[PDB]
From a paper:
RNA polymerase II (Pol II) is the enzyme that transcribes protein-coding genes in the nucleus to produce mRNA. Nuclear import of RNA polymerase II (Pol II) involves the conserved factor RPAP2. The RNA polymerase II associated protein 2 (RPAP2) was identified by co-purification with Pol II and its associated factors RPRD1A, RPRD1B, RPRD2, GRINL1A, and RECQL54,5. RPAP2 and Rtr1 were also described as phosphatases that target the Pol II C-terminal repeat domain (CTD).
Here we report the cryo-electron microscopy (cryo-EM) structure of mammalian Pol II in complex with human RPAP2 at 2.8 Å resolution. The structure shows that the highly conserved N-terminal domain of RPAP2 binds between the jaw domains of Pol II subunits RPB1 and RPB5 in the downstream region of the Pol II active center cleft. We observed unambiguous density for RPAP2 residues 48–155 and confidently modeled this region including side chains. In addition, the N-terminal region of RPAP2 contains an ‘insertion’ (residues 116–128) that forms two β-strands and thus deviates from the corresponding region in S. cerevisiae Rtr1, which forms an α-helix13. Residues in the RPAP2 insertion are conserved from Drosophila to human, but not in yeast, suggesting it is a metazoan-specific feature of RPAP2. The interaction of RPAP2 with RPB5 is mediated by helices α1 and α3 of RPAP2 and helices α5 and α6 of RPB5. RPAP2 residues E63 and D92 form salt bridges with RPB5 residues K85 and K81, respectively. Indeed, superposition of our Pol II-RPAP2 structure with the structure of the Pol II elongation complex (EC)19 revealed severe clashes between RPAP2 and downstream DNA. In contrast, double-stranded promoter DNA alone could not displace RPAP2(1–215) from Pol II (Peak 3). Together, these results show that PIC formation displaces RPAP2 from Pol II before transcription starts.
Author numbering:
A (entry chain B): 614 to 820, 827 to 833, 844 to 874, 888 to 1060
B (entry chain B): 155 to 243, 253 to 256
C (entry chain B): 16 to 52
D (entry chain C): 2 to 132, 146 to 271
E (entry chain F): 50 to 127
F (entry chain A): 1395 to 1416
G (entry chain A): 361 to 429, 438 to 458, 470 to 489, 500 to 519, 537 to 913
H (entry chain L): 15 to 58
């Protein structure tokens, strides 16, 4: 018997001889969770679900799913004492972002879990009031067209990090190497992954005074520039002078030409009562040809080159792909999970309902998605006839094009030129 | 620590959070030390008050029995004894 | 009494109840509450 | 060695899109017409923003980009106006720019939907396409947005903000008579909109002597320019570009000879 | 007695072209007729194939005995 | 084979087996 | 000294050329001394000033005084912003200035810093002393007999040949329409007069033994005569660097200086042709017909039945163990062999399923270096997951996962993934594959560090070994390592694989 | 110089060596307003 | 060392992952054990 | 500070010529036209119109670099027919083609309305 | 944050359709029927309108800096 802190456990179902303790009445009660005070604690106290730790896991023989393990078939094990609520719960927060993770290989899932930590997007709802250094906010975050039910509880749709873009998997002009991708310049002008980078500088004075020395033109009478002024390279945003026992200058520069526009200025008294200041400056980051973007399946990849809409290839309906990616990168960076995500995204966009990418579903496979896509006047396999942008010639090989969720990453040329 | 039972944000509605400049979706569970949001990462350690039998190769002991023991953080955070047996290369415990 | 072919919605609303009852950082909050109390 | 005789057959005429067919023409000219549709048709869009006050939850350049991405009805104003570098005036004049003024204050408790309808332009003939309205920003109580903008002349090469077309569906040879695409499974490919084949026959027989004619165009306007006006302006611009290239080539030839 | 390969090594070529280019960049007299192209490297190589480079190469044997070689008699495969 | 022969003769010309400098 | 920036590919650049942003180019300068026949251009640059890019920054007189940015004369060392044609090192590359702010290179041999030397001697010596699975597929598709190019397409491809003589070859077909062939275009790409024989990957061994041994029924062994592709499909072994390939033979015959031009011409022409022909990958490339899928499922079921029979016989344990191993090792070896051979057979069947149109086959037949297993996993079966060279260990008490029974040695447990990536992995298979991938990541992480340490140790071991002027190899302390390099005193990059033709044949 | 508060949003006057303290508000975290100078935002 | 670092506030998913993570005592824990099923994200 | 503005993509820089004619010495009766600040539009139509001319041996266009707004058009024609007048005839043919197309499009617009 | 104007792929106006989109959503109109009624035939416009996250209300929940 272990009652000490530290041990790790997960809650999961309790099974009778061959039946679950979870009945239809519990489901009905949980359906109207509000105005009924019937929460998960009541389910635990009802002897339906219980917490099993690693120690008890050896002594218990779990059931993966109740749909076809307690039924009557070729006998494998009839002493099912416990059942998992859902296998997809084995994944973590970052692993739940991947759609159809079972269709990928584990290195790709690990790589995407790493990428999602540095994926650019809105991070908190109150980013305006708070001042945290090295903050990135995306212009137009979007829900993925292909999502997992776990992401419902991660509040990803509440505030996401990434944009759904029309991605075609083609080799267009050679700027589409194993990692690089080529995006639509006109659509970037329309708002691909446009971001604001907030940087916060904190300064304190102590016995140092905030005063404008007699470039310092933008400085106010208080020694601090008012917010809303465009600051270029080699510019002073904070006017601080320290007494010299004629006066030494201890001002702060813009850290090697970090161009931007000052957003907010704050002055307050510290614990000692000395006045300190905080400057939040926002810089506009429009995706250049050095910014790195990653799908939910595939390695980190910089932008190859940006083509305008007329340069970009177009389908019979004039849908120029948002981003063209390397077909040859399937063995290297991205898997067929990316292709299935594109197919399900096309199906969801045509149908309207957001596609479900539950890892272990057994009811949403490639064939059903293909049939759904074919039902909407499209090729079942997601291929489409594309026309060359430069010459207008009909490309011999039909390009696989569909909407896919892409994520801008913190690694940018604008961040590292300074 | 944020969102704890002793924090001011405990038991606050969405409007209450979005009238004191706080994100309702913020999970909390972190401290604010010198204005910096610091999170304590659970450290992995060997379980206490349990007997483990191991077999080291280079060590002269064929089998070693270890048991880290405490009195629920009352004092002396480490207190372990070993019950080993010498290799015959006669089994002296 | 039984939930055949309806298992998906049942288990997902069960997970929903677990998550909106406890949360994501429930372990840290519970540990801190135990430490303080 | 000389020109063919193109024919234009318009099937659908609508305030938002035009569907037509160009016959007896080579593929490159049709592709260039599509290219000029997308990129080389000058329209008017807001390009100089000065925000006097912005209390909204959106930063200033967000509002500037949204304003610049709003279409403005410029069916006949583009011809009268001239480009900034082609105009020898001060930074702005009414002859090379259009002035817009926005001034909204949310003094009411409910959210104020500051839309393109609140954009007031001195020139009456050029206005946002609304006269639903293009939602610019949403203002909480006590939030005020005041700004002055100038809209200039430009085309899609400068920026996508000056793209007049919304969707340019360009097609040719709906049935693979020329076999420009090799379908691995032709039976599973959906029939084109302009396909003349029967249900049983998935693909047309190969035509060894065939070349691309009968290009189908579906040009959808964004509201800033009539699609027929879009096509006419595109043709005029391509003709002007070719005439300028003629002038430069003749000058260089007579200089070198 | 002068025993050594008659060819000129890649490293020898690199150093002799570098030294000749540096000299002619310091306005040393040039023995080959000049063209309109300006780059000192190009005139260095074109005087090289002209076979009138005014520098001999000393080749040090491992023991320490030198062995002079006029660049005129160093035939070039490339 | 030239590289392997050079490597082997480099650390066997001393008259006895020698380890790498490391 | 310099500014580091991420590298972005640019096919239009030369293989020896690097694209440098104008800002980084103007950030650091190259020092040049005044020459009587370059005074005008240096005067123009110094008149332009530091405000513009193609200018200069500092001037040093004969006395060493430094002047910031005006008379220029002999002996003045002025540092000017680097321009096109300069040499920089990270191997030296020619500098080309491009608008945006990223370094650009071609990826054909396989964030980083760059440096440009100041003195002319080091520049000259670096100048004199200093196609990755991407164009191979399009080359393979381009050399197909099916490739016929129209007059305009031929002209467009021809314009991208830097070594083109300007004479348009007569098309392979004159009537009814003038149609060229991709083989003709690549023949124009091939420089000089190269003669090469190289069997294709698809080329079976029975073609030579039987008839049609050089009329090539299945577009068999590649033959190139007089520097032009007579026949065959150019796969990786026939184009990539290897023993007696087209690139290798062309290099050894007439110089890397134009082997680089061969690379550039191949890349440009192939990219421009693929612009109209197009290449893609999608769902349909993993939907191999129901016949092959049923065959794969039947083979997997047979393998599972064989493993079950082995387990039940091992329970009856008559089953005399093989010598040199215990029962556990022998039976684990038997199970592993059964699973591995079943996986290999399923993968081979899946690869043979792709007849002509599958886009995966294009990479498989050409880039078969390490892509065969990935394709087999994608279509046929992921395969057995191994940890430490063995199946999944019993982490729990005699049980891999709590969802199985105790002492379960069947294929379902122990980490065999019956389903492929398309069909999706079961949660147990997903966890076992996660374990396998974690082991692979650990192995790669340790292997890279160990390989780097070994490389550093080895290069430090014999960094001072040099070939002396007496055709002898000596170290720093001047001991003769070898009387002649390689026991023959001859370079290792100018040799080839050959056959004696008199050692094997009988008397 | 006109200077605003943090929660009551009432303008306050702050001079040199003036402690940060809003009048009749009780709050001491506070902000400053926008500039009146000309600034150009390109609508690209 | 290795405990109580600044919270990762770059993404909400990043913040959630940082708030839910585990550090091994070692400064063979390299591999992923079978017992981590359900306990720890693989 | 590094990002190139959008106006110079089509605007002609001062001191640089719009079109430059260079004689191709290595092929008789051949020429190269370097046209600055132009995309694939004019190059493509000019190449197609030149191929329409049966008195040309070679006719093509190239963009050496997408980032550099410049096109190289190679024209090789028959003897007693220099590429210059071939280029002039092709561009005049394009102008006449576009004029006729514009007139017929106006006629079609008139017919479609109130009809 | 707010509904984009001129959806990125093709450029069709979608910034004036968000409010009508929500009005149709509150009605019996389903997702696909609402998208068709708004006139977004191309699936890029449907992607733009469907996947959009309206963070503007969440941001406006906080009190403004100036009253
Ligand atoms: Zn004017
Ligand atoms: Zn106050
Ligand atoms: Zn659209």
């Amino acid at each position: 018997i272990y009652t000490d802190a530290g041990r790790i456990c997960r809650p999961l179902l309790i099974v009778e001889k061959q039946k679950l303790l979870l009945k239809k009445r519990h489901i009905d009660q949980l359906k109207e969770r509000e105005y009924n005070n019937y929460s998960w604690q009541d389910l635990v106290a009802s002897g339906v679900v219980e917490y099993i730790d690693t120690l008890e896991e050896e002594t218990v023989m779990l059931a993966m799913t109740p749909d076809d393990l307690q039924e009557k078939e070729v006998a494998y094990c009839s002493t099912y004492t416990h059942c998992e609520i859902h296998p997809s719960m084995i994944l973590g927060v970052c692993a739940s972002i991947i759609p159809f993770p079972d269709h990928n290989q584990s290195p790709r899932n690990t790589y995407q879990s790493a990428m999602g930590k540095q994926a650019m997007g809105v991070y908190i709802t109150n980013f305006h009031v708070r001042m945290d250094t090295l903050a990135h906010v995306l212009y137009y975050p979007q829900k993925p067209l292909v999502t997992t039910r776990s992401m419902e509880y991660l509040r990803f749709r509440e505030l996401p990090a990434g944009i759904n873009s029309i991605v075609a998997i083609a080799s267009y002009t050679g700027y589409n190497q194993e990692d690089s991708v080529i995006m639509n310049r006109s659509a970037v002008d329309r708002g691909f992954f446009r971001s604001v980078f907030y940087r916060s500088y904190k300064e304190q004075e102590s016995k140092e005074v905030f005063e404008k020395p007699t470039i310092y033109d933008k400085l106010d009478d208080d020694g601090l520039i008012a917010p809303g002024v465009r600051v270029s390279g080699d510019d002073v945003i904070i006017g601080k002078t320290v007494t010299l026992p004629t006066k030494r200058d201890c001002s702060t520069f813009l850290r090697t030409s970090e161009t931007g526009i000052v957003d907010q200025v704050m002055v307050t008294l510290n614990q000692e009562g000395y006045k300190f200041c905080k400057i939040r400056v926002r810089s506009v980051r429009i995706p250049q040809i050095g910014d790195k973007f990653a799908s939910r399946h595939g390695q980190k990849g910089t932008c190859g080159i940006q083509y305008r809409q007329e340069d970009m290839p177009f389908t019979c309906e004039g849908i120029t792909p948002d981003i063209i990616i390397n077909p040859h990168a399937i063995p290297s960076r991205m898997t067929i999970g990316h292709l299935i995500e594109c197919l399900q995204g096309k199906v969801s966009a045509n149908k309207g309902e957001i596609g479900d990418a539950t890892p272990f579903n057994d009811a949403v496979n490639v064939q059903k998605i293909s049939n759904l896509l074919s039902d909407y006047g499209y090729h079942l396999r997601g291929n489409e006839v594309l026309y060359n942008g430069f010459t207008g010639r009909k490309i011999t090989s039909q390009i696989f094009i569909g909407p896919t969720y892409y994520q801008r990453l913190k690694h940018m040329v604008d961040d590292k030129i300074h | 620590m944020l969102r704890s039972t002793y924090c001011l944000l405990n038991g606050l509605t969405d409007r209450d959070l979005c009238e004191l400049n706080e994100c309702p979706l913020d999970p909390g569970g972190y401290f604010i030390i010198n204005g910096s949001e610091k999170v304590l990462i659970a450290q992995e350690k060997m379980a206490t008050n349990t007997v483990y039998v191991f077999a080291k190769k280079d060590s002269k002991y064929a089998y070693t029995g270890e048991c880290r023991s405490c009195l629920e953080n009352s004092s002396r955070p480490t207190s372990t004894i070993w019950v080993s047996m010498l290799a015959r290369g006669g089994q002296r415990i | 009494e039984i939930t055949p072919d309806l298992w998906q919605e049942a288990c997902w609303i069960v997970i929903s109840s677990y998550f909106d009852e406890k949360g994501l950082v429930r372990q840290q909050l519970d540990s801190f509450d135990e430490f303080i109390q | 060695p000389y020109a063919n005789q193109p024919t234009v057959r318009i099937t659908e005429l609508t305030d938002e899109n035009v569907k037509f067919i160009i016959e007896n023409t080579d593929l490159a000219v049709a592709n260039s017409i599509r290219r000029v549709f997308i990129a080389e048709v000058p329209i008017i869009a807001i390009d100089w923003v000065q925000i006097d006050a912005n209390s909204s939850v959106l930063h200033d350049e967000f509002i500037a980009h949204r304003l610049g991405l709003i279409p403005l009805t410029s069916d006949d104003i583009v011809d009268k106006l001239q480009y900034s570098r082609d105009c020898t005036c001060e930074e702005f004049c009414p002859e090379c720019s259009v002035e817009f003024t926005l001034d909204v204050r949310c003094n009411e408790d409910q959210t104020r939907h500051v839309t393109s309808r609140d954009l007031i332009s001195n020139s009456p003939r050029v206005i946002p396409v609304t006269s639903d309205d293009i939602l610019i920003v949403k203002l909480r109580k006590g939030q005020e947005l005041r700004l002055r903008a100038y809209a200039k002349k430009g085309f899609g090469k400068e920026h996508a903000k000056w793209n007049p077309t919304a969707g340019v569906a360009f097609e040719y040879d709906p049935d693979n008579a020329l076999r420009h695409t090799v379908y691995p499974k032709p039976e599973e490919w959906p029939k084109s909109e302009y396909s003349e084949l029967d249900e049983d026959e998935s693909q047309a027989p190969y035509d060894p002597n065939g070349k691309p004619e009968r290009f189908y165009y579906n040009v959808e306007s964004c509201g800033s320019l009539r699609p027929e006006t879009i096509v006419l302006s595109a043709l005029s611009g391509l003709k002007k570009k070719l005439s300028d290239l003629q002038t430069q080539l003749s000058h260089e030839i007579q200089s070198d000879v | 007695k002068r025993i050594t390969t008659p060819y000129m090594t890649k490293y020898e070529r690199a150093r002799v072209l570098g030294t000749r280019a540096l000299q002619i960049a310091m306005c040393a007299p040039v023995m080959v007729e000049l063209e309109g192209e300006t780059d000192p490297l190009l005139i260095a190589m074109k005087e090289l194939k002209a076979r009138k480079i005014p520098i001999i190469i000393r080749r040090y044997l491992p023991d320490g005995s030198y062995e002079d070689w006029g660049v005129d008699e160093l035939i070039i495969s490339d | 084979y030239r590289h392997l022969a050079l490597l082997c003769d480099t650390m066997t010309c001393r008259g006895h087996l020698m380890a790498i400098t490391r | 000294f310099s500014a580091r920036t991420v590298i972005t590919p640019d096919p239009n650049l030369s293989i020896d050329q690097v694209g440098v942003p104008r800002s980084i180019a103007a950030n650091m300068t190259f020092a040049e001394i005044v020459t009587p026949f370059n005074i005008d251009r240096l005067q123009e640059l110094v008149r332009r000033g530091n405000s513009q890019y193609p200018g200069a920054k500092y001037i040093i007189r004969d006395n060493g005084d430094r002047i910031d940015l005006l008379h220029l004369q002999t002996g003045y060392k002025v540092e000017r912003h680097m321009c096109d044609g300069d040499i920089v090192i990270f191997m030296g590359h020619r500098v080309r200035i491009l608008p945006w702010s990223t370094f650009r290179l071609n990826l054909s041999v396989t964030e980083m810093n760059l440096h440009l030397p100041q003195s002319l001697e080091t520049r000259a010596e670096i100048q004199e002393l200093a196609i990755v699975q991407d164009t191979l597929t399009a080359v393979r598709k381009f050399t197909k007999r099916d490739v016929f190019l129209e007059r305009g397409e031929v002209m467009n491809l021809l314009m991208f040949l830097s070594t083109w003589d300007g004479k348009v070859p007569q098309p392979a077909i004159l009537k009814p329409r003038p149609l060229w062939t991709g083989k003709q275009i690549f023949s124009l790409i091939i420089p000089g007069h190269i003669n090469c024989i190289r069997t294709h990957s698809t080329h079976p061994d029975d073609e030579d033994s039987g008839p049609y041994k050089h009329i090539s029924p299945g577009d068999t062994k590649v033959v190139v005569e007089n520097g032009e592709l007579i026949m065959g499909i150019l796969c990786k072994k026939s184009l990539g660097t290897s023993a007696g390939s087209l690139v290798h033979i062309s290099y050894l015959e007439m110089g890397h200086d134009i082997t680089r031009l061969f690379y550039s011409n191949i890349q440009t022409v192939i990219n421009n042709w693929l612009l109209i022909e197009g290449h893609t990958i999608g769902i349909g490339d993993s939907i191999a017909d129901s016949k092959t899928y049923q065959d794969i499922q039947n083979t997997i079921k047979k393998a599972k039945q064989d493993v079950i029979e082995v387990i039940e016989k091992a329970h009856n344990n008559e089953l005399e163990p093989t010598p040199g191993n215990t029962l556990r090792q022998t039976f684990e070896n038997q199970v592993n062999r059964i699973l591995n051979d079943a996986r290999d057979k399923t993968g081979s069947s899946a690869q043979k399923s792709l007849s002509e149109y599958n886009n995966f086959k294009s990479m498989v037949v050409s880039g078969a270096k390490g892509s065969k297993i990935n394709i087999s996993q994608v279509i046929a079966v992921v395969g057995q997951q191994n940890v430490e060279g063995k199946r999944i260990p019993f982490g729990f008490k005699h049980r891999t996962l709590p969802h199985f029974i105790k002492d379960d040695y069947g294929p379902e447990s122990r980490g065999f993934v019956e389903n492929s990536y398309l069909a999706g992995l079961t949660p147990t298979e997903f966890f076992f594959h996660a374990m396998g991938g974690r082991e692979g990541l650990i192995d790669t992480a340790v292997k890279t560090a160990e390989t780097g340490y070994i490389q550093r140790r080895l290069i430090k071991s014999m960094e001072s070994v040099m070939v002396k002027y007496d055709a002898t190899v000596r170290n720093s302390i001047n001991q003769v390592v070898q009387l002649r390099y390689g026991e023959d005193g001859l370079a290792g990059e100018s040799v080839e694989f050959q056959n004696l033709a008199t050692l094997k044949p009988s008397n | 110089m006109i200077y605003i508060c943090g929660e009551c949003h009432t303008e306050n006057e702050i001079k040199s060596r003036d402690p940060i303290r809003c009048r009749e508000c009780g709050y001491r975290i506070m902000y400053k307003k926008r500039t009146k100078r000309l600034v150009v935002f390109d609508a690209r | 060392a290795g405990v109580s670092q600044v919270l990762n506030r770059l993404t909400f998913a990043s913040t959630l992952s940082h708030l839910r993570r585990l550090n091994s005592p070692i400064g063979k824990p390299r591999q992923l054990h079978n017992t981590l099923w359900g306990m720890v994200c693989p | 500070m590094n990002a190139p503005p959008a106006f110079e993509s089509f605007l002609l820089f001062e001191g640089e010529k719009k079109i430059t004619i260079n004689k191709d010495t290595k092929v008789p009766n051949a020429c190269l036209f370097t046209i600055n600040k132009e995309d694939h539009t004019l190059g493509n139509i000019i190449k197609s119109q030149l191929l329409k001319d049966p008195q040309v041996l070679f006719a093509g266009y190239k963009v050496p670099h997408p980032l550099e707004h410049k096109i190289i058009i190679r024209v090789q024609t028959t003897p007693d027919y220099s590429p210059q007048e071939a280029f002039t005839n092709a561009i005049t043919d394009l102008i006449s083609e576009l004029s006729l197309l514009e007139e017929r499009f106006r006629v079609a617009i008139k017919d479609k309305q109130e009809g | 944050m707010i509904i984009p104007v001129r959806c990125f792929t093709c450029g069709k106006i979608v910034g004036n359709k968000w409010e009508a989109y929500l009005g149709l959503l509150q009605a019996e109109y389903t997702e696909g029927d609402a998208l068709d009624a708004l006139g977004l035939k191309r699936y890029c416009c449907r992607r733009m309108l469907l996947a959009h996250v309206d963070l503007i209300e969440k941001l406006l929940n906080y009190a403004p800096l100036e009253k």
